[PDB]
């Protein structure tokens, strides 16, 4: 199933990737690692297509906390670039409100003032 | 070599021995018209090496050939460098000037490969070894003066990479130049020539040399500042009791306070170059604003006249006037 998933990724068929990934989650019933990998892939593809809510659901389902956090960072970054801040506001923070605050803070204290809109 | 030989030997010797003896130039109008043409011709070829210098750094064979000329340079008896020989000298200064090594432009590795002063450890040593010699030029103030400007360059390069072997020889080199009252030779001979008022790049290079002194070697300067402040008080106070001062006194800090007072005194370019002395921080700005405050400590009567002349130079340009008007206001709100 993972082999077909890699095929469909280069194939550039995101929806097929997602459904097959869901089927593969089912086969990996006890393997938390594999579950986390496939869910991460699903989140990634949803984020790439603009499916914010689905992306957030996939994020809240990843068993691995580190993977979930990195995915959260990626989501935040992407939504900022697309100016979809309303959805970002709606999405609750799993005790990571302060984490988000800190990420943006660090971005600011690391980027040129006259170019980026992180501060804003 | 050819460029220097032709220019000098042709223009001086011919006019002086043929056009001034035979008076081949007919009237009082032709004699000036031809003299102005020759004096414009020389000044043109000196501006050429000057214009080229501020754009292109010199290669190894040329820097040695421009040094091979400044080993013979003389000064008019009237105490004012001929407008030509002066610019030729301030030209080599900008070539040797490692002020391009102090700018944070990231072509610093490309410029160190194009500046022939570097890449040849034999270059820095050959210049330092020659200026440390005791065969002075046709103006002993020349061997001492050039010895100083190179030493300000030997100190600045210390920051770049790890070239810190010749940083020691910048202490006795600056003392030798200061003991030659180089602060006096640059006030009377260089700025005394009314033609120095013309070239802007004669002002920027000296303003760079005067500003690179207190922050490139802020250790050698603070030593040479603290030493004289103490050497002045000790003898002045001991002379007040019963005796007469030693004839071997060298108040180069007075002459330096005059030099900073004569340089920024005239304002034809509206630059307000005195903006460097006023701090509203880059390590350079702290070492300068300190130098304004570190020099205010001296209270000996021997440095009162020049430090007043220095502030006369620093108070050029409206902004530099108000700030210096506020500095005097607070210093007595007691400082002399």
């Amino acid at each position: 199933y993972n082999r077909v998933l890699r095929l469909l990724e280069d194939v550039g068929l995101p929806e097929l990737v997602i459904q097959l990934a869901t089927i593969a989650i089912g086969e990996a019933s006890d393997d938390w690692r594999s579950q986390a990998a496939l869910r991460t892939r699903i989140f990634k593809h949803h984020l790439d297509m603009g499916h914010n809510n689905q992306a957030y659901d996939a994020l809240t389902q990843i068993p691995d906390p580190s993977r979930q956090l990195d995915c959260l960072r990626q989501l935040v970054v992407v939504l900022c670039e697309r100016s979809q801040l309303q959805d970002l506001v709606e999405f609750p923070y799993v005790n990571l409100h302060n984490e988000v605050v800190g990420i943006i803070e660090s971005r600011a204290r690391a980027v040129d003032l006259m170019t980026h809109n992180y501060y804003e | 070599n050819k460029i220097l030989t032709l220019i000098s030997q042709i223009d001086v010797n011919n006019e002086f021995d043929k056009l001034k003896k035979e008076r081949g130039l007919g009237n009082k109008k032709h004699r000036k018209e031809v003299s102005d043409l020759i004096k414009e011709c020389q000044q043109s070829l000196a501006h050429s090496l000057y214009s080229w210098s501020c754009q292109t750094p010199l290669n190894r064979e040329d820097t040695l050939l421009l040094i091979g000329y400044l080993e013979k340079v003389t000064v008019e008896g009237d105490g004012s460098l001929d407008k030509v020989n002066l610019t030729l000298l301030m030209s080599l200064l900008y070539c040797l000037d490692v002020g391009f090594l102090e700018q944070g432009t990231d072509d610093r590795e490309e410029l160190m490969k194009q500046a022939s002063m570097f890449m040849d450890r034999q270059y820095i040593a050959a210049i330092h070894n020659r200026l440390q010699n005791t065969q002075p030029w046709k103006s002993p103030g020349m061997q001492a003066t050039v010895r100083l400007a190179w030493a300000l360059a030997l100190r600045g390069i210390s920051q770049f990479s790890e070239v810190l072997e010749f940083s020691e020889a910048d202490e006795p080199m600056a003392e030798i130049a200061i003991g030659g009252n180089v602060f006096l030779f640059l006030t009377e001979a260089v700025v005394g020539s009314e033609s120095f008022c013309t070239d802007e790049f004669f002002i920027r290079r000296i303003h760079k040399l005067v500003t690179d002194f207190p922050t490139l070697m802020p250790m050698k300067v603070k030593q040479l500042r603290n030493r004289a402040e103490e050497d002045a008080r000790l003898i002045q106070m001991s002379m007040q009791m019963g005796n007469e001062p030693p004839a071997s006194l060298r108040r180069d800090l007075e002459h330096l306070l005059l030099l900073i007072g004569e340089l920024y005194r005239k304002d034809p370019f509206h630059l307000e170059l005195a903006l460097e002395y006023w701090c509203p921080p880059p390590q350079r700005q702290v070492l300068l604003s300190k130098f304004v405050r570190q020099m205010s400590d001296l209270l000996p009567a021997t440095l009162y006249l020049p430090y007043l002349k220095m502030l006369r130079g620093l108070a050029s340009g409206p902004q530099c006037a108000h700030y210096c008007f506020s500095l005097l206001k607070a210093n007595g709100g007691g400082s002399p």
Binding site: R6, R33, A37, K44, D64, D70, V77, R107, A110 | -
Partner: protein, 324 residues
């Protein structure tokens, strides 16, 4: 009468006569005529000496003189010198290759005996020998721009070097290839037309995956030819995001990832490589790249090496944050 004696004798030891003629001319303020006479001579092993002498005498003719015609003639003599040099080095090469090729010697004699035209040279010296470096030099000088041709020439050079290096130890082959590439690049560094970066990098990395060499080789080589670290990073990232299935097929996508990691680590250890004024933005960019790489590593099935790489990347991220 010295001058006309010389001219007459030279027209009728012609080399000696014309040399004397040009010397006398230069002394008597007639270097232009010196030049003309010398060029006439040039046009008119012994021929090898004639060419060396011609070059010397035309150099003497136009020391500074920028006379269009004569200056171009001197440039052509330098390009004729180019011909001579390339011919001799490559002749050594192919001679020693084909049991001291007799035909190589014949061709060299022909090339020295007379100046050849681009078309002829190209065709002839291609079929028996394939002098790709020489062809590249030729096109560069003329100004002919054919990207495909340039790429093909580069590929062929590498392949010939590899055929000759098969006998040597892996390390020796690698070093020789590195040196050759670096030298040739330094010649065409200013011209991006004759230096196809993307293609070259890709082909070389492919060769590395095929011959199982070090991951950081390419990165080091490119840093040595003064290729800016930002630019190299950009190229690598682009190659990675292209999702070329070649890497997946060679069972080495992680190898390319590790090569990127090595490049990045080398930058961090010595930050002076990047210019001082661009350091902050470059650090921010690295922090973003690291984030995306980590996200992909986490979408893949876990493995011990994968986890080690993930930890390394997080440490790099922390260090970069501390730096910024």
């Amino acid at each position: 009468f010295l001058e006309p004696h010389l001219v007459r004798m030279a027209k009728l030891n012609k080399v000696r006569y014309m040399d004397l003629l040009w010397r006398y001319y230069e002394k008597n303020r007639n270097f232009s005529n010196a030049a003309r006479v010398v060029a006439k001579l040039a046009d008119m092993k012994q021929r090898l000496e004639y060419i060396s002498r011609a070059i010397l005498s035309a150099k003497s003719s136009t020391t500074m003189s920028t006379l269009a015609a004569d200056g171009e003639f001197l440039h052509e003599l330098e390009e004729k010198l180019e011909v001579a040099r390339i011919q001799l080095q490559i002749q050594e090469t192919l001679t020693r290759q084909y049991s001291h090729h007799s035909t190589v010697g014949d061709a060299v004699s022909q090339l020295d005996s007379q100046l050849m035209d681009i078309t002829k040279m190209f065709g002839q010296y291609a079929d028996p020998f394939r002098l790709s470096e020489c062809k590249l030099a030729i096109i560069h000088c003329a100004g002919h721009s054919d990207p495909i041709l340039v790429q093909t020439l580069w590929q062929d050079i590498i392949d010939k070097e590899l055929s000759d290096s098969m006998g040597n130890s892996s390390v020796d082959r690698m070093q020789s290839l590195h040196l050759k590439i670096t030298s040739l690049g330094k010649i065409y560094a200013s011209t991006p037309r004759y230096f196809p970066l993307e293609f070259l990098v890709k082909y070389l990395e492919q060769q590395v995956c095929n011959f199982s060499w070090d991951a950081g080789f390419v990165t080091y080589t490119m840093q040595e030819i003064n290729v800016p670290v930002p630019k190299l990073l950009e190229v690598y990232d682009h190659l990675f995001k292209a999702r070329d299935p070649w890497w997946s097929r060679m069972k080495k996508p992680l190898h390319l990832l590790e090569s990127i990691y090595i490049l990045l680590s080398g930058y961090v250890q010595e930050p002076s490589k990047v210019p001082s004024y661009e350091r902050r933005r470059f650090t921010t960019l690295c922090l973003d790249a690291i984030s995306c790489y980590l996200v992909e590593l986490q979408s893949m099935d876990p493995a011990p090496a994968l986890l080690n790489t993930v930890s390394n990347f997080k440490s790099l991220q922390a260090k970069l944050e501390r730096l910024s």
